[PDB]
């Protein structure tokens, strides 16, 4: 699917003739399933049928369920996306710590390099030079924590020294919202690959289902940081709409200009292929 | 041909 | 006699009496507005077994029970014809009535012969006697239940009305009266469709949830 | 929670006053939220509300969705306050090879013993004595392949020497149908346990995605072959009608006479708990 | 205004908007029968602030909202007479209308004299001009919420009707639409009384229990 459908209104959803049926008292509209990529329910008054959920699982469409506050609550995870998952589990169990730490280190280097590119586009020479120094100083096992220092200096330089990631302000709320959406898309891509999402490539002690999808989604955070930095003065609703405009906007991949969903799918495919082939090629994404 | 389809308030 | 709207997945068949309950006030008001505007709007489509769409003139819509006029020229004419047929089915009563009419015609004929002017006449028939008697249905003292029952009785007299529909008419009648209305509708064979916002307990009906799911309900 | 709510019939679900409202054509039932533990939807005609999905996200209860085939398709994944089953999958990833070989050998011994006992009920002493000899001769790592040797004896005894599993006939299709139903039930039980069905007990073949449930359902397989042997002359439709009555029929568990669903549930629970606790007790089922 | 029946202990007053719920189906159907038969039956009574009985002609009873025609012979007669009075209040405008009508009558009279057949005419009047223009209230209603608003406008325009009564008309409107109808009734000052079989949640209404006792709600 190419289309992200967001339903914030109370209505009923049915599945008829390979077609999503939106039935409401005011109007009714039918949208084909093949064109639909992601389905987002932003309200608790929406009704749906289990048959349409089964058709969405067969169509491999990500379904997101939000709360009354409109923040995402729980997303649907299919058990078997493809038959290659059961064969990929043995490869994930056969993975090596050198390949995991190497791919994760290269991914963190791509994220820090993207932050230095964002500060370079923002015309900060000292900040991007320091973040570039931390990128050149990144090492295996991360003994210096140059990634966390790059994040602290990045947010502290962008939003001011008094700003912090632990604050309850709408800036951190929008950051966690964009990280939740990108984490949902990357997690759905990991479900398409079939590998276990709970197994991370960095720390084996930390146990989280979103760890792998976060490690894959680390380089794309600065794209959310840019719109969050531009819309920071706007209200949280307009910032959420601008965050929704990221799906409509296109970004330039090394090969050509593509949509965000295609870049995430091809990037995750190259990451899984690189993990199974033990680092044949590392996909690099630049702003 | 719209990428983001919104059924609800148009914000 | 199947009716279909955009909210329904498949066209629902209406046979004898049918109780349709719409739990959503917006879909119910929109459906009733589509019932009054039916000729203008293409959303609500009612078709017979031939799949041919019935005209609004063939559709009979009823909301106010006591405000509707049950006495019409066609209804009273066909009713007088039915009474004439009932009197014609019995030979003895028809013979006696013919005798009395013959006597009255003899008296009036003698009175005409007594006059100086030349007078001519034809006959005094039974339909003219019923029209002179002024036979008509009485809705003045009738209760709402007897009014709806008389409407179900005169629906067979209406030739052009294909289907009768009632809007929120089940709120006045008690459960037993509703059972009598349905049991009488099964004998009358007419097609009646009731639309209520709330479900009635104890009768079979089609329920439309706010989820827009149509389900059969025994109670 | 404790009770596991499963909906096998068409119905609608709502949430009112901390109370789950389940509405079916026959009757309406209201269940407290604290009493429910795991929620499973068997069919595609069930209707649910997103508000009850959000209350389930606050209640941590696991939501399981199934297709028309009854095989579990997708499950609800919350972003925070995850269920304990996701923490229980790590133990399934930690399952030792000795425990898997012990449980697999016990399962094969139970299936072969049930086949020989069924042949004894069919009053064939030589074939049942041979299958019993192969049961007493079964060993770890399966060098003798006594299971594949007892197969041809069991089928050749039941349907005759001319019959085979490779041939295309209504008997083979009926066997695959019964194995599909039992695979759906056992797969639903394994999905209720939370363990990944892609990881199998047999270490040789990872091809099938149901390998865990396919290995757990082996001891109950001959009960299908009995009805298939009695109805073998009937058409495949009549064989499906006869196999559809196994859900209504009651079978004798070691403890007490029970339905097949409860027996498969207790067997699956004992299998999972035994795998996590490294072979405390092995559930044994005999015809 | 107040309404009184044998079931109530004391007559209840109806001021601005009023919602009356009858929990007994027999008392509700018999009450509507007493509403349509009010001229025939003396059981149901209505006493205004002057404590004087009112004829059924002064009571406006409307059950079907969409089935009630806004354009009637009496309504169009009172509207045309009102417009004729407004035009009669200004002598200059009516004089200009008489001049234009005189010009048109002169032109049509000349065309009639040009014809070979004899023609006789009388005159043209302002009432015939209004009836020829087809002046009437707007017949466009998108929903029952707007149609009930037009019924409230025509009811407030009619001086002869002292009360407007709706029977089971609140089931079509949403709670918010009921709030807008109550606020519009309080702004229009007209007396409206509703009769519902069941109670409505969120709004103030008088509940009549099956025990016949009447109790206020909200
Ligand atoms: Ca005559
Ligand atoms: Ca007479």
Numbering used by the authors:
A (entry chain P), D (entry chain O): 3 to 289
B (entry chain Q): 100 to 110
C (entry chain D): 1 to 219
E (entry chain C): 1 to 218
What's written in the study?
However, the type II-A CRISPR-Cas systems of Streptococcus thermophilus and Streptococcus pyogenes encode four Cas proteins: Cas9; Cas1; Cas2; and Csn2, all of which are essential for adaptation in vivo (Heler et al., 2015, Wei et al., 2015). We show that the Cas9, Cas1, Cas2, and Csn2 proteins of a Streptococcus thermophilus type II-A CRISPR-Cas system form a complex and provide cryoelectron microscopy (cryo-EM) structures of three different assemblies. The structures we present here shed light on the initial stages of spacer capture and reveal an unprecedented higher order assembly of Cas1-Cas2-Csn2 proteins that appears to play a role in this process.
Finally, a filamentous form comprises monomer units (typically 2–6) assembled around a continuous DNA duplex with an interface again comprising eight Cas1 and four Cas2 subunits but in a different configuration to the dimer complex. Although the filaments were few in number, of variable in length, and less well ordered, some preliminary analysis was possible. A structure for the basic unit of the filaments, comprising two monomers and an interface between them, was obtained at 7.7-Å resolution. This filament repeat structure shows differences to the free dimers. Second, the interface between monomers contains a pair of Cas14-Cas22 dimers but in a different configuration to the dimer. Attempts to morph between the two dimer complexes, to model the conformational changes required to interchange between them, revealed that the changes required were too extensive to be a simple, one-step conversion between these forms.
